[PDB]
Amino acid sequence: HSQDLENLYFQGSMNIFEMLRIDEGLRLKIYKDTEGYYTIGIGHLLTKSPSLNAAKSELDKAIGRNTNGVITKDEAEKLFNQDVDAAVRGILRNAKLKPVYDSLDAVRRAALINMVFQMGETGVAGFTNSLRMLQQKRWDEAAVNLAKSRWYNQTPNRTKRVITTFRTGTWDAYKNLRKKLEQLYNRYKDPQDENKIGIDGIQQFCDDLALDPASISVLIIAWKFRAATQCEFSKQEFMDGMTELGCDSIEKLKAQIPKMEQELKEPGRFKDFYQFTFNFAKNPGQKGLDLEMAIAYWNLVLNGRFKFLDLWNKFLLEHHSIPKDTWNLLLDFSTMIADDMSNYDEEGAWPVLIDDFVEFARPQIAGTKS
Ligand SMILES: Cc1ccc([C@H]2c3c(C)nn(-c4ccccc4)c3NC(=O)[C@H]2NC(=O)c2cccc(C)c2)cc1
């Protein structure tokens, strides 16, 4: 098959795909990008359709099998390589980019393609003076000039690596990044399971970030790392998260935490975080969340947000598992409910648990009015 990666085995193992895996990151399951559009792989837009089945249909045509929204890294590379071919075709019919592209060695061409993936042809073509420097092989001067750009300010760590690639014509920046992340991961990894960071590594991670392990900030990090389950941090999660956060160091991750916290001031992002917490907290082997665990995470994530949290605890501690829908709807309840619960709609198909809670809160609500 034309797309078989075996056709690239004559190349180096470092390539544009591995470069963008580092710089942009790789998603092997369909997800919604920034504009809400179904995407997979390295930034491969599947469709602007709101229909996930439409996205899966586009993915199956592109991959050539029934994927059900999940692909392998190799399949993602094949998708990416098609996108690279298209980007190269575009470069080559761009009067402003073709001269420099033709002039560049293969590694520096990858750096230019990286730029085109990030900012598009018109964006890259705006770098007239730096592109001339590159075309003249004035590498250090190009590097200096590119670093003065807004590009650098937007994505300093990626941009630094791309610039280094222009400067050196080598993959050093990517080798160095990979090694940095490997060596940081190795600081935290479970001595008995190379594939995860365990409790002790998470403790060390928190210590290195000067975070109380029981703080919401730690759960916020897990959320940004799309961690699957509490008390584990898989190698994939760690690497993917550091990539997506643009961090290759603990200092950089530390500087990112307030930005993740700031993201939560958006109710839509807080809802995402809130819903994330359910699957994260739940035992993988279980379909629902143990009430005791639910209470613990509710108190972490809803304290200060859910005005009846204290009554909710009292209610639940008198109760003798929580399904995802009930977890989710508690936030909806929290958002709509009047300070005295007078606007509860019993016919709103709330969980029975919430119906019962509204009934339970009656003595307290009556006492307060008294
Ligand atoms: C040292 C350490 C701190 C926190 C935890 C969990 C945990 C546990 C076991 N109770 N727990 C909690 C529950 C309610 C209130 C307060 C804390 C939490 N709060 C979460 O962030 C938990 N976070 C993770 O596992 C986890 C996974 C992947 C990446 C990252 C960065 C974290 C375990 C170990």
PDB file of C-alpha atoms and ligand atoms in Angstrom, residues 199 202-203 205-206 213-214 218-219 221-222 227 229-233 280 296-297 300, ligand 1:
ATOM      1  CA  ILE A 199       1.167   6.734  44.514  1.00  0.00           C
ATOM      2  CA  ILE A 202       2.446  11.151  42.414  1.00  0.00           C
ATOM      3  CA  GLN A 203       3.554  12.199  45.897  1.00  0.00           C
ATOM      4  CA  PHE A 205       5.322  14.984  41.666  1.00  0.00           C
ATOM      5  CA  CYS A 206       3.142  16.921  44.090  1.00  0.00           C
ATOM      6  CA  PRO A 213      -1.609  16.066  47.590  1.00  0.00           C
ATOM      7  CA  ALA A 214      -5.187  16.575  48.855  1.00  0.00           C
ATOM      8  CA  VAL A 218      -3.716  18.045  41.953  1.00  0.00           C
ATOM      9  CA  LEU A 219      -7.057  16.925  40.559  1.00  0.00           C
ATOM     10  CA  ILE A 221      -3.622  18.558  36.912  1.00  0.00           C
ATOM     11  CA  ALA A 222      -5.066  15.075  36.531  1.00  0.00           C
ATOM     12  CA  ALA A 227      -5.812  10.909  33.731  1.00  0.00           C
ATOM     13  CA  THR A 229      -7.954   6.893  37.273  1.00  0.00           C
ATOM     14  CA  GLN A 230      -6.913   8.308  40.599  1.00  0.00           C
ATOM     15  CA  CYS A 231      -3.620   7.138  42.153  1.00  0.00           C
ATOM     16  CA  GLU A 232      -2.235   6.186  38.738  1.00  0.00           C
ATOM     17  CA  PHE A 233      -0.601   8.446  36.222  1.00  0.00           C
ATOM     18  CA  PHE A 280     -11.404   9.534  37.395  1.00  0.00           C
ATOM     19  CA  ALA A 296     -14.996  12.918  49.110  1.00  0.00           C
ATOM     20  CA  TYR A 297     -14.690  14.208  45.565  1.00  0.00           C
ATOM     21  CA  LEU A 300     -13.239  18.670  46.993  1.00  0.00           C
TER      22      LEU A 300
HETATM   23  C1  LIG B   1      -0.063  12.128  46.055  1.00  0.00           C
HETATM   24  C2  LIG B   1      -1.498  11.927  45.542  1.00  0.00           C
HETATM   25  C3  LIG B   1      -2.369  12.999  45.446  1.00  0.00           C
HETATM   26  C4  LIG B   1      -3.658  12.796  44.981  1.00  0.00           C
HETATM   27  C5  LIG B   1      -4.068  11.532  44.603  1.00  0.00           C
HETATM   28  C6  LIG B   1      -5.489  11.280  44.116  1.00  0.00           C
HETATM   29  C7  LIG B   1      -6.452  11.317  45.344  1.00  0.00           C
HETATM   30  C8  LIG B   1      -6.806  10.410  46.382  1.00  0.00           C
HETATM   31  C9  LIG B   1      -6.254   8.992  46.549  1.00  0.00           C
HETATM   32  N1  LIG B   1      -7.712  11.036  47.167  1.00  0.00           N
HETATM   33  N2  LIG B   1      -7.955  12.269  46.694  1.00  0.00           N
HETATM   34  C10 LIG B   1      -8.860  13.228  47.287  1.00  0.00           C
HETATM   35  C11 LIG B   1     -10.222  12.972  47.282  1.00  0.00           C
HETATM   36  C12 LIG B   1     -11.066  13.899  47.854  1.00  0.00           C
HETATM   37  C13 LIG B   1     -10.551  15.051  48.432  1.00  0.00           C
HETATM   38  C14 LIG B   1      -9.189  15.299  48.439  1.00  0.00           C
HETATM   39  C15 LIG B   1      -8.340  14.381  47.860  1.00  0.00           C
HETATM   40  C16 LIG B   1      -7.231  12.494  45.602  1.00  0.00           C
HETATM   41  N3  LIG B   1      -7.142  13.670  44.739  1.00  0.00           N
HETATM   42  C17 LIG B   1      -6.804  13.483  43.352  1.00  0.00           C
HETATM   43  O1  LIG B   1      -6.193  14.660  42.851  1.00  0.00           O
HETATM   44  C18 LIG B   1      -5.963  12.252  43.040  1.00  0.00           C
HETATM   45  N4  LIG B   1      -5.060  12.483  41.924  1.00  0.00           N
HETATM   46  C19 LIG B   1      -4.478  11.351  41.272  1.00  0.00           C
HETATM   47  O2  LIG B   1      -4.698  10.233  41.615  1.00  0.00           O
HETATM   48  C20 LIG B   1      -3.624  11.739  40.076  1.00  0.00           C
HETATM   49  C21 LIG B   1      -3.624  10.958  38.928  1.00  0.00           C
HETATM   50  C22 LIG B   1      -2.864  11.383  37.842  1.00  0.00           C
HETATM   51  C23 LIG B   1      -2.137  12.573  37.863  1.00  0.00           C
HETATM   52  C24 LIG B   1      -2.189  13.361  39.019  1.00  0.00           C
HETATM   53  C25 LIG B   1      -1.413  14.683  39.102  1.00  0.00           C
HETATM   54  C26 LIG B   1      -2.950  12.946  40.113  1.00  0.00           C
HETATM   55  C27 LIG B   1      -3.205  10.456  44.713  1.00  0.00           C
HETATM   56  C28 LIG B   1      -1.920  10.655  45.185  1.00  0.00           C
END
